[PDB]
Scaffold this motif. Structure first.
Motif, PDB file in Angstrom:
ATOM      1  N   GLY A 178      36.898 -10.105  -3.905  1.00 58.37           N
ATOM      2  CA  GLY A 178      38.068 -10.527  -4.663  1.00 58.37           C
ATOM      3  C   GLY A 178      38.780 -11.741  -4.087  1.00 58.37           C
ATOM      4  O   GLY A 178      39.350 -12.546  -4.840  1.00 58.37           O
ATOM      5  N   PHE A 179      38.795 -11.881  -2.753  1.00 60.20           N
ATOM      6  CA  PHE A 179      39.370 -13.091  -2.152  1.00 60.20           C
ATOM      7  C   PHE A 179      38.560 -14.327  -2.524  1.00 60.20           C
ATOM      8  O   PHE A 179      39.106 -15.434  -2.666  1.00 60.20           O
ATOM      9  CB  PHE A 179      39.427 -12.968  -0.627  1.00 60.20           C
ATOM     10  N   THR A 182      39.154 -15.025  -6.461  1.00 61.27           N
ATOM     11  CA  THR A 182      40.455 -15.589  -6.793  1.00 61.27           C
ATOM     12  C   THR A 182      40.589 -17.049  -6.354  1.00 61.27           C
ATOM     13  O   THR A 182      41.586 -17.699  -6.695  1.00 61.27           O
ATOM     14  CB  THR A 182      41.558 -14.700  -6.193  1.00 61.27           C
ATOM     15  N   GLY A 219      45.841  -7.903   2.734  1.00 60.37           N
ATOM     16  CA  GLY A 219      45.820  -7.119   1.513  1.00 60.37           C
ATOM     17  C   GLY A 219      45.217  -7.875   0.341  1.00 60.37           C
ATOM     18  O   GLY A 219      45.357  -9.092   0.210  1.00 60.37           O
ATOM     19  N   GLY A 220      44.550  -7.126  -0.543  1.00 61.60           N
ATOM     20  CA  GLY A 220      43.914  -7.721  -1.709  1.00 61.60           C
ATOM     21  C   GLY A 220      43.384  -6.664  -2.654  1.00 61.60           C
ATOM     22  O   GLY A 220      43.204  -5.500  -2.282  1.00 61.60           O
ATOM     23  N   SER A 221      43.127  -7.090  -3.890  1.00 61.54           N
ATOM     24  CA  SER A 221      42.507  -6.207  -4.868  1.00 61.54           C
ATOM     25  C   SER A 221      41.116  -5.800  -4.406  1.00 61.54           C
ATOM     26  O   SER A 221      40.375  -6.606  -3.829  1.00 61.54           O
ATOM     27  CB  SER A 221      42.410  -6.899  -6.228  1.00 61.54           C
ATOM     28  N   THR A 223      39.126  -4.470  -6.815  1.00 69.62           N
ATOM     29  CA  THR A 223      38.507  -4.303  -8.125  1.00 69.62           C
ATOM     30  C   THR A 223      38.466  -5.613  -8.907  1.00 69.62           C
ATOM     31  O   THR A 223      38.571  -5.602 -10.138  1.00 69.62           O
ATOM     32  CB  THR A 223      39.253  -3.237  -8.936  1.00 69.62           C
ATOM     33  N   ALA A 224      38.295  -6.755  -8.225  1.00 68.75           N
ATOM     34  CA  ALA A 224      38.484  -8.035  -8.908  1.00 68.75           C
ATOM     35  C   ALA A 224      37.418  -8.328  -9.958  1.00 68.75           C
ATOM     36  O   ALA A 224      37.633  -9.204 -10.803  1.00 68.75           O
ATOM     37  CB  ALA A 224      38.535  -9.190  -7.897  1.00 68.75           C
ATOM     38  N   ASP A 226      36.405  -5.950 -12.061  1.00 74.43           N
ATOM     39  CA  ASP A 226      36.557  -4.888 -13.048  1.00 74.43           C
ATOM     40  C   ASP A 226      37.751  -5.138 -13.960  1.00 74.43           C
ATOM     41  O   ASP A 226      38.731  -5.773 -13.569  1.00 74.43           O
ATOM     42  CB  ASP A 226      36.749  -3.532 -12.361  1.00 74.43           C
ATOM     43  N   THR A 229      40.970  -8.150 -17.177  1.00 75.53           N
ATOM     44  CA  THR A 229      41.335  -9.403 -16.523  1.00 75.53           C
ATOM     45  C   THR A 229      40.500  -9.660 -15.271  1.00 75.53           C
ATOM     46  O   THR A 229      40.871 -10.501 -14.447  1.00 75.53           O
ATOM     47  CB  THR A 229      42.821  -9.412 -16.171  1.00 75.53           C
ATOM     48  N   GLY A 230      39.385  -8.944 -15.111  1.00 71.38           N
ATOM     49  CA  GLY A 230      38.508  -9.157 -13.981  1.00 71.38           C
ATOM     50  C   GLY A 230      37.702 -10.435 -14.122  1.00 71.38           C
ATOM     51  O   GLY A 230      37.735 -11.122 -15.143  1.00 71.38           O
ATOM     52  N   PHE A 231      36.946 -10.740 -13.063  1.00 71.70           N
ATOM     53  CA  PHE A 231      36.294 -12.045 -12.950  1.00 71.70           C
ATOM     54  C   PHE A 231      35.389 -12.333 -14.145  1.00 71.70           C
ATOM     55  O   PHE A 231      35.404 -13.443 -14.693  1.00 71.70           O
ATOM     56  CB  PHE A 231      35.502 -12.114 -11.633  1.00 71.70           C
ATOM     57  N   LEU A 234      37.242 -13.035 -17.378  1.00 71.66           N
ATOM     58  CA  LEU A 234      37.988 -14.285 -17.299  1.00 71.66           C
ATOM     59  C   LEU A 234      37.071 -15.498 -17.413  1.00 71.66           C
ATOM     60  O   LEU A 234      37.386 -16.457 -18.132  1.00 71.66           O
ATOM     61  CB  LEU A 234      38.759 -14.303 -15.977  1.00 71.66           C
TER      62      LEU A 234
END
Lengths: 443, 443
Positions: A178-179, A182, A219-221, A223-224, A226, A229-231, A234
């Protein structure tokens, strides 16, 4: 289990070392990446970037390939990605539609310089697995809308490769994915400029940063990938990704099948069929610019889509011109790095370019082993008194199924360094002596 | 003239220093940015990021706000953006739908530390102008799909601000805009984690890098906003941008109208109306958790969309809970930083949270001066014996139309530092002495 957890688990539990063919291909990939990086060591974009990072400062921890100095890990990823991709001489992959090793290997060099060097080769296989599957899963509209796969998918792939190398936990890998996601970016509007190769370095850097954040307990999601609005929702096609991303993981490894293509020419892969064919014609028929009235270059429909320059003005533009590639060979010049620089194309060669036309043949059957699938090129020369001669290539030298010899590999390395240095580099890689390899690539 | 050239020319030729109001507002923005950054100085995410950049190294050239040390310019933009946004205490803007000063000021602090400090105030005005116009122009689908404006539009706004500060030419600025656009990223899936404030620093860093690339004569597209694969086609609504991006530039400056909102509370701006309203009821009617049966909180439809937590479990989740904000005040606690940390919410307050309900009123007309336009909140408290009392807020304290007093700004600044320190910072800003301002905010 969602897509984020599924990819993290697939990466984490990968056993690439069990595949002799994948380990062999990763060793050849390190050598091709090194040869491509060396070949660009004089590129003036490199010193622009070196002056930038020297103004910023950093600990001299990681070699800058071919440049004789070290820099901080995140800086080295940006520099080494640019260096490897600057000449369009680095490797390609049919699933990636991008520059896989130019993104992945700089991230792993930064990781390996700080330890876990014994996991570099497996991490490389795993990084290629991720980037190939991302390229397959994101959907065709991603590239068509204007995103550049090397940048948009490279950061996630680099984060997964480093995450494997440094043995991130399931939770850490989910966060690092997720990092990376994003930060994922990159626009095809930058093609034709040196920002296009810099995308490879910025992706490597973003993926390495993603891992360092996860290791810092940032800290981070988790589930990025999923959700609505996931990758994939998007940037692409989440339904495609749900069916393709994880299916049949590592069986076979994408670095082997369909496999990395290592280039013998420093220009667009889509011109390599014509380059092989015209060299064959010049050798077997002794055609030349003097005795050739005109040329027809025959593609299947869409086969020349990447060759966007029909009237290039510089060698750099000529990297994407089948016309320039053929005319250069017809005028007796080697298909080599010095002829694909920003310098202008001479008038004599532009004249010959005007006698080369492309045509499209939707009936001819591509060979069962053609690379990429469905691809071929026929070059037809028109001589005096109505004679013609023709040559056809379906699987260019360097592509899977027509792979480079060890002699080709060392020849690509000795464009820049003496034979004995190239031999020592190959020996280090063959024995998986990654520390010795890292010491060698600094010059 | 295309959109890329149009924005570059509008930025480059701006004369913000001719607007007395915009300069005054920029000075107030610097003070609020400093106050928010100071208020977050003990956040543990700052120490994770400091250890990260200390492992990388870099020249100690730019202060890390409130942390008593210096770092390299690109590192400082990443750190200082995180610091400013980490508490959700930093400013907001109705057009931006994001964190404008947390992106723009860190990029400018890094620029000003290396020269052109005398252009920081005008550059700040110009950066806010760009980020506001980007947020208005990109279209509502951008945020709805899952992109985080702070990250995706902040990089370009930071590039334009620094590009103004450093007096880039038309061509340099066109390229810097494209270098920022090709890095623009950021996903709302990161909300609720400290990756969300890091988006502000990564955007500041990306915009600063964009300018440094342009100054290094790095090659790149000069038309990244334009055409079918340009930034607005790729991420938003290019037809809207063609009508809105450049209309009525700097007349009046967006930093004034609709204007930046400087927060008196360290939580989501959408809960500030209820916070003001419940404090009015506690002050005028002496309501309390003990003497209220339950609370009804009335929004226009959609007015509470950002307040996604109806049953928060921590103070951090409570930043996005109107229920927690109201319950906290009813229990006699200050609406202050210490109650919005990651520590759990006590059982007594959670019980009160269960007696607070949201209802929606589509008929009540928002006041003409409401901020954001169309927004209000009514808090209605139910006491023993069927009695009720109500308070309504449309323009919360700190928003344009209900601006902070001089004492308010001093109070926010002295949360963390002595009166004398805050006064020295205010005098430096009032005199536009940016070098002195940079010296004072390091601690």
């Amino acid at each position: 289990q969602g897509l984020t957890a599924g990819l993290a688990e697939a990466v984490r539990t990968s056993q690439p070392e069990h595949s002799v063919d994948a380990i062999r291909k990763a060793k050849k990939g390190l050598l091709d990446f090194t040869a491509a990086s060396f070949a660009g060591r004089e590129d003036k974009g490199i010193q622009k970037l070196l002056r930038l990072i020297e103004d910023e400062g950093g600990r001299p921890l990681v070699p800058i390939i071919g440049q004789g100095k070290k820099a901080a890990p995140l800086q080295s990823a940006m520099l080494n990605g640019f260096i490897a991709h600057a000449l369009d001489f680095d490797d390609v992959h049919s699933d990636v539609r991008g520059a896989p090793s130019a993104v992945i290997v700089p991230a792993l060099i930064a990781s390996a310089a700080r330890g876990h060097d014994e996991r570099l080769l497996g991490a490389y296989i795993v990084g290629v697995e991720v980037m190939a599957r991302l390229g397959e899963s994101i959907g065709s509209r991603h590239y068509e809308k204007g995103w550049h796969n090397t940048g948009t998918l490279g950061a996630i792939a680099a984060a997964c490769a480093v995450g494997y190398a440094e043995e991130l936990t399931q939770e850490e890998l989910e966060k690092a994915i997720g990092f990376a996601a994003t930060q994922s970016a990159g626009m095809r509007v930058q093609f034709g400029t040196e920002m296009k190769p810099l995308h490879a370095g910025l992706a490597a850097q973003a993926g390495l940063l993603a891992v360092k954040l996860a290791q810092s307990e940032f800290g981070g999601s988790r589930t990025a990938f999923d959700g609505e609005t996931g990758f994939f929702s998007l940037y692409g096609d989440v339904e495609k990704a749900q069916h393709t991303l994880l299916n049949d993981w590592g069986a076979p490894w994408r670095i082997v099948q369909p496999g990395l293509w290592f280039k013998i020419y420093p220009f667009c892969s889509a011109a390599h069929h014509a380059a092989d064919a015209v060299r064959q014609l010049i050798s077997e028929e002794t055609i030349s610019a003097a005795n050739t009235e005109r040329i027809e270059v025959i593609f299947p429909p869409g086969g020349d889509a990447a060759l966007t320059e029909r009237s290039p003005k510089t060698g750099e533009e000529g990297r994407f011109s089948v016309e320039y590639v053929i005319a250069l060979a017809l005028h007796g010049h080697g298909l080599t790095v010095e002829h694909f620089s920003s310098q202008p194309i001479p008038n004599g060669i532009q004249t010959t370019i005007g006698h080369i036309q492309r045509v499209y043949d939707n009936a001819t059957q591509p060979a069962p082993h053609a690379v990429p699938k469905g691809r071929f090129t026929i070059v037809r020369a028109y001589l005096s008194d109505g004679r013609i001669c023709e040559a056809r290539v379906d699987c260019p030298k360097g592509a899977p199924g027509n792979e480079l010899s060890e002699e080709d590999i060392i020849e690509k390395l000795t464009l820049t360094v003496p034979q004995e240095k190239a031999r020592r580099i190959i020996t280090a890689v063959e024995k998986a002596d990654i520390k010795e390899f890292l010491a060698h690539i600094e010059l």
